[PDB]
From a paper:
Here, the X-ray crystal structure of a construct of hDus2 encompassing the catalytic and tRNA-recognition domains (residues 1–340) determined at 1.9 Å resolution is presented. It is shown that the structure can be determined automatically by phenix.mr_rosetta starting from a bacterial Dus enzyme with only 18% sequence identity and a significantly divergent structure. The overall fold of the human Dus2 is similar to that of bacterial enzymes, but has a larger recognition domain and a unique three-stranded antiparallel β-sheet insertion into the catalytic domain that packs next to the recognition domain, contributing to domain–domain interactions. The position of the recognition domain is stabilized by the three-stranded β-sheet insertion in the catalytic domain, which packs next to the recognition domain. Interactions between the extended C-terminal helix of the recognition domain and the three-stranded β-sheet of the catalytic domain that were not seen in bacterial Dus enzymes appear to extend the domain interface and may stabilize the overall structure. Density-modified SAD phases resulted in clear electron-density maps and autobuilding was able to produce an almost complete model. The FMN density was nonplanar, hence the two-electron-reduced form (PDB ligand ID FNR) was used during the refinement. Part of the positively charged and conserved area of hDus2 corresponds to the active site containing the bound FMN molecule. The corresponding segment of hDus2 (residues 118–128) is not defined in the electron-density maps. Conservation of the catalytic residues indicates that the enzymatic mechanism is essentially the same as for the bacterial homologues. We propose that structural differences and differences in the electrostatic surface may result in altered positioning of tRNA during catalysis compared with bacterial enzymes.
The reduction of uridine to dihydrouridine at specific positions in tRNA is catalysed by dihydrouridine synthase (Dus) enzymes. Bound FMN functions as a cofactor during the reduction of the C5—C6 double bond of uridine. Increased expression of human dihydrouridine synthase 2 (hDus2) has been linked to pulmonary carcinogenesis, while its knockdown decreased cancer cell line viability, suggesting that it may serve as a valuable target for therapeutic intervention.
Residue numbers in the entry: 7 to 119, 129 to 339
């Protein structure tokens, strides 16, 4: 049901791509939102729990930590990314989450101790997945050192029946400071019979909404996935123009509290948004903050925090045995 053509996509990002960021990207016009990479070996340990208090579906590890949290609002739009090096374990993890997500993605940059380097194994993991789940299956790659090797590999990958491929147009051995190769992404999109999601354009190509469609045309790709630009301000997806960072940060913080996001993750994401402004008044208050309450107070959201905490407590009582 998920279509990968002509879309704006939030790229998978460790730490950044937890539920609050995903929901905020959807608010601002992203069509598809990837979660952070999560490890198959960790996910197989988790229990699926319907959390009626938060109105979420939680995947909860044996140490009681919530590894992945989702909700009905993103069900039709969220793509689950795993790091895997074992076909049958990947498939078990996909079946664990498949009823709560719209797509399953494999990060080819992830090791086998990169998967990208081993077409035999890629073909096995991806064909096992494609055959075994009712959701579309994608993968995400970095380009190889030679143009010709890159084109042969993607032809191999494509024959596994995946629905789309995201291509970060940088070689493994080069920083984000090196220019992105639109030439290569164009050659891949020209070659492949499946949609290609261009990636790697933030900063050097993508500073405002209209840069996204420009990058898509330069790459001749079907869609564009955005990571760093969205991490800095997820209203990058909004056709009408960027929103003021204060509005965005407050909206982020509200989601983080309403979905009981761990405060260290909330703080990490805010620090990425405030990257040029750690010395601003709010920057310094954030730095000192050691709890979600203190994060909220740093942004003028103390009354919001108290009220929401009371709401979530009252919801918990309402939904307990005693009320029955
Ligand atoms: C903080 C952070 C975290 C991650 C990443 C990046 C950043 C900045 N990236 C890579 C990312 O998806 C993307 O390919 C690159 O950042 C290039 O695209 P942009 O130019 O940033 O839009 C990444 N890639 C991936 O496949 N899975 C992941 O979970 C991560 N995590």
């Amino acid at each position: 049901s998920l279509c990968y053509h002509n879309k704006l996509i939030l790229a998978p990002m460790v730490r950044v791509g937890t539920l609050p960021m995903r929901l905020l990207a959807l608010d601002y016009g992203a069509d598809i939102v990837y979660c952070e990479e999560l490890i198959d070996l960790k996910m197989i340990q988790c229990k699926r729990v319907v959390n009626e208090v938060l109105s979420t579906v939680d995947f909860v590890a044996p140490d009681d930590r919530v590894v992945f949290r989702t909700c009905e609002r993103e069900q039709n739009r969220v793509v689950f990314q795993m790091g895997t090096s074992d076909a049958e374990r990947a498939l078990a993890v996909a079946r664990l989450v498949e009823n709560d997500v719209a797509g399953i993605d494999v990060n080819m940059g992830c090791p086998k101790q990169a998967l990208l380097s081993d077409p035999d194994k890629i073909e096995k993991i991806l064909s096992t997945l494609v055959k075994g789940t009712r959701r579309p299956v994608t993968c995400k790659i970095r380009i190889l050192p030679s143009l010709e090797d890159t084109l042969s590999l993607v032809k191999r990958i494509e024959r596994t029946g995946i629905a789309a491929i995201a291509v970060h147009g940088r070689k493994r051995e080069e920083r984000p400071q090196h220019p992105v190769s639109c030439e290569v992404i164009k050659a891949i999109a020209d070659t492949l019979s499946i949609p290609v999601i261009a990636n790697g354009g933030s900063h050097d190509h993508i500073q405002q909404y209209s840069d996204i469609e420009d990058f898509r045309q330069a790459t001749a790709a079907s869609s564009v996935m955005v990571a760093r630009a969205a991490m800095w301000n997820p209203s990058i997806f909004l056709k009408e123009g960027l929103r003021p960072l204060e509005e965005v940060m407050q909206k982020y913080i509200r989601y983080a509290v309403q979905y009981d996001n761990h405060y260290t993750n909330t703080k990490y994401c805010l620090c990425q948004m405030l990257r040029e402004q750690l010395e601003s008044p709010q920057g310094r208050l954030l730095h000192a903050a050691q709890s979600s309450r203190e994060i909220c107070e740093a942004f003028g959201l103390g009354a919001f925090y108290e009220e929401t905490t009371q709401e979530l407590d009252a919801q918990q009582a309402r939904l307990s045995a005693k009320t029955s």
